Amino acid sequence: MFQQLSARLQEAIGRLRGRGRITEEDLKATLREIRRALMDADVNLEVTRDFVERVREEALGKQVLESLTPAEVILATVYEALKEALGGEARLPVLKDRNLWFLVGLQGSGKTTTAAKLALYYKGKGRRPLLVAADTQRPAAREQLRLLGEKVGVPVLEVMDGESPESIRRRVEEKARLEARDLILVDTAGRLQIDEPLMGELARLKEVLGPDEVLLVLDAMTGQEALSVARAFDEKVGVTGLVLTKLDGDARGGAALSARHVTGKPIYFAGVSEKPEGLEPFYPERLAGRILGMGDVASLAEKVRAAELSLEDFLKQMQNLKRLGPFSEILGLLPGVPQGLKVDEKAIKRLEAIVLSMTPEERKDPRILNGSRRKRIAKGSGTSVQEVNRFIKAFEEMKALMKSLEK
């Protein structure tokens, strides 16, 4: 699981194996080693920060510097550390006599699939699920859920072209009553970007339908970008939990390890394969062990492994720079004011958002951008037509510089 981070925590735990009692200066290195592993895995900072500190702390209190098997103490420690960062105990939305959940996320995060696989899971534990295809614009989207429901053996209510939230409220809560369905899984609409109109319609649908839980589905392969999307949706709809998919395709895990601290919401289910049974209830203890090598199962990749710019890129390089701390020394040459921290966390999020509301094609070539677009983008994101146009120019220029310095 998370091969990079996994391999590295192990090299570190391992080097202490068979050495006998170690010295403090040895433990001080093992801690650095771990800190590196997390920082290179994109694990958030106060998370990495706290991870290490919780280790050094729990370790000493376990008589590390005086134990005969120091290695097995770091292992027991790094384990509980991971457990914590991942939520501690396995949680699962609490059930009732009547349940109505919302399934929100971007298009291509496995939302529609999850709906079905989630319906299938609970059916297997008694509940009488009802799936609702709530995208009033895309008939093709609804049809996909329809067939997924036929396969898992669950009923499906398809809304209608242009149906109003109140009409749906009725139709839905009427069919679940008559047919005795205690778990309603509503697959909202999903697109490749965050756009105001829909995020507004979704907000309203919630207001009207009154969901008991709102599960946000995030593709783990998208790294940090997943944590920005979490922010977009809680900020505008209200998420009650997470579902991390394509979790077997993430090599870092920085997103999953930081999701709890950064978003505050828990992880309920996580996909660990593309098999239907692949969507299993998330357990921190399991993921913890696996990361450290216990009870893990090799993944398709883990097996194959044992045998010009882009706006997306630009944003990321800034993200990676901020993370490498301040460059006091490089700034020691230029008499420019110390602490070029005009780049405060909050100033990057404005950009992280600008990109999120941009069309996928517009990110490939911001040039195509016209005025009517920036207007749009600026609205969806929560910024000014200026910040947007500015941000873009900053890119265009860096693109040309980046390009020139090649020839």
Side-chain angles (χ1 to χ4, degrees):
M1 266 289 88
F2 311 148
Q3 190 183 300
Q4 260 184 49
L5 168 61
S6 203
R8 242 167 297 188
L9 289 183
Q10 292 189 49
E11 202 179 6
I13 299 191
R15 273 190 268 283
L16 266 47
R17 274 264 150 56
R19 273 218 265 182
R21 174 180 174 172
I22 54 172
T23 79
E24 182 177 295
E25 283 288 339
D26 285 316
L27 168 47
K28 250 195 61 181
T30 282
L31 296 183
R32 265 175 281 152
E33 294 195 57
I34 285 182
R35 175 200 173 65
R36 296 275 213 182
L38 292 176
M39 277 181 70
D40 297 298
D42 274 2
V43 178
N44 169 277
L45 248 73
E46 145 94 352
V47 186
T48 301
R49 214 184 81 194
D50 190 29
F51 196 98
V52 189
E53 265 58 66
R54 177 177 193 296
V55 163
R56 139 183 279 291
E57 208 180 69
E58 299 271 305
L60 290 176
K62 288 292 208 72
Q63 314 325 311
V64 168
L65 283 185
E66 309 132 18
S67 183
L68 218 51
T69 55
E72 271 282 338
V73 166
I74 294 306
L75 166 54
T77 281
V78 178
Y79 178 59
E80 284 288 318
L82 292 173
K83 273 173 68 174
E84 195 189 284
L86 288 167
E89 322 174 309
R91 298 183 47 187
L92 266 181
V94 67
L95 295 178
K96 299 154 51 187
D97 290 306
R98 302 291 291 186
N99 299 85
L100 175 75
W101 296 357
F102 259 33
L103 275 173
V104 295
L106 283 168
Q107 176 197 351
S109 59
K111 199 186 73 291
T112 291
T113 310
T114 294
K117 290 182 187 169
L118 203 43
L120 172 53
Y121 170 83
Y122 276 118
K123 178 191 179 181
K125 299 213 309 179
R127 301 286 157 156
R128 309 194 71 233
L130 174 71
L131 287 161
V132 191
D135 185 323
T136 52
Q137 279 176 53
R138 273 177 192 157
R142 292 191 307 254
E143 190 165 67
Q144 300 314 309
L145 189 56
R146 183 216 304 157
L147 309 189
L148 292 170
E150 286 201 2
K151 184 187 178 194
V152 291
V154 172
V156 174
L157 183 67
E158 292 187 49
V159 290
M160 281 181 270
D161 276 340
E163 191 161 330
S164 68
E166 303 88 7
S167 173
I168 300 179
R169 157 180 48 187
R170 200 199 57 148
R171 284 255 300 302
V172 181
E173 303 208 289
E174 178 178 353
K175 175 169 191 154
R177 189 184 71 225
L178 302 183
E179 286 178 42
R181 304 296 166 179
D182 58 4
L183 187 49
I184 312 178
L185 301 173
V186 186
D187 173 43
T188 67
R191 306 299 183 226
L192 310 176
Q193 331 83 192
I194 312 288
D195 8 49
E196 200 44 31
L198 273 76
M199 289 294 277
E201 309 186 14
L202 174 60
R204 184 73 226 293
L205 183 72
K206 181 185 180 184
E207 196 179 304
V208 175
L209 294 188
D212 288 290
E213 294 277 351
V214 165
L215 302 184
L216 173 45
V217 188
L218 295 176
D219 163 10
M221 289 186 77
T222 52
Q224 299 305 285
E225 194 182 306
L227 294 183
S228 303
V229 169
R231 189 171 58 243
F233 283 81
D234 185 50
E235 216 160 65
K236 305 177 199 180
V237 170
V239 177
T240 49
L242 306 184
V243 168
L244 301 169
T245 61
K246 307 169 72 187
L247 198 48
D248 63 281
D250 182 353
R252 274 93 191 302
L257 278 161
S258 318
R260 197 67 159 64
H261 170 84
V262 183
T263 83
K265 320 293 176 168
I267 309 182
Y268 289 160
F269 302 78
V272 183
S273 100
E274 319 308 84
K275 317 179 190 308
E277 300 172 309
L279 181 68
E280 64 194 28
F282 187 59
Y283 303 90
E285 316 92 310
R286 274 298 274 143
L287 182 60
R290 300 184 52 164
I291 288 187
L292 297 178
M294 294 166 266
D296 192 10
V297 184
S299 69
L300 349 164
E302 293 195 317
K303 280 206 180 78
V304 178
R305 290 191 179 190
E308 205 176 58
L309 238 65
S310 66
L311 191 54
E312 282 283 15
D313 279 48
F314 177 68
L315 173 64
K316 202 180 171 192
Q317 283 292 285
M318 297 196 91
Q319 298 188 298
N320 281 168
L321 259 45
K322 212 302 167 186
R323 164 192 286 288
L324 287 172
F327 307 101
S328 42
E329 255 73 27
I330 302 188
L331 304 176
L333 298 182
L334 290 43
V337 304
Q339 307 177 359
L341 308 182
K342 294 303 174 189
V343 288
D344 46 63
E345 284 164 63
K346 301 302 172 181
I348 294 188
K349 295 184 179 176
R350 312 269 307 177
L351 307 186
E352 278 182 29
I354 300 178
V355 194
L356 235 34
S357 308
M358 283 187 56
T359 267
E361 287 289 313
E362 306 179 324
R363 298 157 182 154
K364 293 206 309 182
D365 197 44
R367 272 148 45 187
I368 63 176
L369 269 182
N370 98 297
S372 214
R373 266 156 152 156
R374 308 199 187 80
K375 203 284 185 295
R376 185 194 90 239
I377 306 187
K379 175 47 187 176
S381 55
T383 61
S384 79
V385 184
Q386 282 87 63
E387 297 181 64
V388 167
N389 186 274
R390 188 187 306 164
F391 171 71
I392 297 163
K393 299 306 157 186
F395 168 67
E396 225 174 300
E397 188 171 62
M398 172 72 101
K399 189 167 188 172
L401 151 62
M402 197 77 268
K403 187 180 176 191
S404 292
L405 279 195
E406 195 65 3
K407 292 171 61 185

